[PDB]
Design a binder for this molecule. Structure first.
Ligand SMILES: CCCCCCCC(=O)O
Ligand SMILES: CCCCCCCC(=O)O
Ligand SMILES: [Fe+2]
Ligand SMILES: [Fe+2]
Ligand SMILES: [Fe+2]
Ligand SMILES: [Fe+2]
Ligand SMILES: [Mn+2]
Ligand SMILES: [Mn+2]
Lengths: 275, 275
């Protein structure tokens, strides 16, 4: 359907818009390139591990490669919905969001190639709870936006994508991987990549907060929706954590990683206010 | 609808894919930031112009600001269609394509703000032919892809977007603006911006060529479709040129700019081969 006119012909970009300012920060701070990371020591590290040590690392990497690929693809309906609503500055910011996710996908796939597991099908480490989130709930919530961009639909999409997938699971996964391999002195290239990724994801969560809060600001009714959609997904979040915990104990303070996930989930709720 | 699995979990990125290699070039060569351009001399230049000189520049700027805003918004259906087809490397490249267009929109809007015309509604310089392309045909061809990603629909979308809008009109517009103001010694900030934009658009046209050619390679039938869709839009291309020519003659070798447009249109055809 047609363009009515163009904001930068009728007027200008809204230079003070929060998402324009976030777009400006993303350009300044978004220069890293996964192609520049030296993975040669990660290759030696992985080869020195015993077979049992080798597969201990793979469930988390399997979870992150799919997470990053899913969020690369599944932000496109959000960008479409906000473009159709004329939210130009959100769209400009989301071009940096999408390109960040492309680099994140690339980083994990380069690591797999470098250490010699690119030919291994890591899907065996996606349990039913993981699939319910990443194969089903995430794409369903985002694709809804092509036919329903109501405030309820936008809140649900931002809740699943930004607050649960990125702000609870990915945030906790970064932390976990850092805890484990930083102390071991292992995989310096991957940890460099994760550091850059974590800096990017700081901006991404601000977009999710902005989006949910501006909708909640219209009607407190929507605060209770946000909380409900968070609680709806929790069983699958903790069900995936329980599965990773059960894998690792079979081959690290798990009670303290499990508590980081609970901490992050509750922190995301506190970043939205009923008013 | 669901994700079946994830390519970077089952395997890796296809490192030799042409669009992966273009993605890598885009990251290396895509560092410029419109926020770094010094427009202070452009402001003085524009203020020194007489009212009649001032409005001579505005029709082209009006055409470019809308062009860049339209192509920023209207690439999203192409990215969606290729993601749904599992073309991961195309999607990674298209994140750089979209972010490039965001910078292009930003650049022209910063220039308008800097020289003091941001408050002017420049839509008066969009004639019927311009509207037929940018307000109607472009968004219609791209949005089709949400419900019809047939090879015919993808060829038509790439033809309107990459070969006509970017490869014929934008290419000729860059050249024209360079010719005119480079020789005058005017608007050095805007010309710097246009130089960076032209470098970006070199990659964009390669994606359009790749996309059309891979579809033509399946069936020569589609070569004749490509030519037909190009010829269908020509009347609006030259009808906009005739209008800009008529404006400028009322306030520069026009016969030679008009011939650059014809040259570019025919050059784009020669970049697709029936086999
Ligand atoms: C064991 C606690 C860590 C859970 C977060 C894992 C998220 C992911 O791997 O994508
Ligand atoms: C006068 C010949 C130049 C025609 C190309 C203009 C395209 C544009 O302004 O977007
Ligand atoms: Fe993210
Ligand atoms: Fe379970
Ligand atoms: Fe372009
Ligand atoms: Fe006409
Ligand atoms: Mn990410
Ligand atoms: Mn452009």
């Amino acid at each position: 359907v047609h363009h009515d006119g163009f904001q930068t012909v009728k007027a200008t970009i809204d230079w003070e818009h929060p998402m324009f300012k976030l777009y400006e920060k993303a350009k300044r701070n978004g220069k890293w390139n996964p192609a520049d990371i030296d993975f040669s020591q990660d290759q030696k590290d992985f080869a020195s591990l015993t077979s049992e040590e080798k597969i201990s690392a793979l469930p988390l990497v399997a979870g992150f490669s799919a997470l990053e690929e899913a969020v690369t693809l599944d932000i496109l309906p959000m960008a479409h919905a906000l473009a159709r609503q004329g939210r130009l500055e959100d769209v400009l910011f989301l071009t940096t969001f999408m390109h960040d996710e492309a680099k994140h996908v690339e980083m994990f796939s380069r690591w797999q190639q470098a250490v010699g597991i690119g030919q291994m099908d890591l899907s065996v480490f996606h349990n039913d709870h993981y699939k319910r989130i990443f194969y089903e709930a995430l794409p369903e919530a985002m694709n809804r936006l092509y036919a329903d961009d109501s405030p309820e639909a936008v809140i649900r999409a931002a809740t699943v994508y930004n607050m649960i997938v990125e702000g609870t699971l990915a945030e906790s996964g970064y932390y976990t991987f850092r805890q484990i391999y930083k102390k071991a002195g292992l995989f310096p290239g991957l940890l460099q990549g994760i550091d850059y990724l974590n800096m990017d994801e700081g901006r991404h969560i601000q977009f999710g907060i902005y989006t949910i809060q501006r909708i909640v600001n219209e009607d407190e009714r929507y605060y209770e929706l946000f909380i409900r959609y968070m609680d709806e997904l929790w069983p699958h979040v903790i069900g995936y954590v329980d599965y990773l915990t059960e894998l690792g104990k079979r081959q690290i303070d798990y009670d303290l990683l499990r508590h980081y996930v609970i901490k992050q989930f509750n922190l995301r709720k506190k970043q939205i206010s009923r008013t």
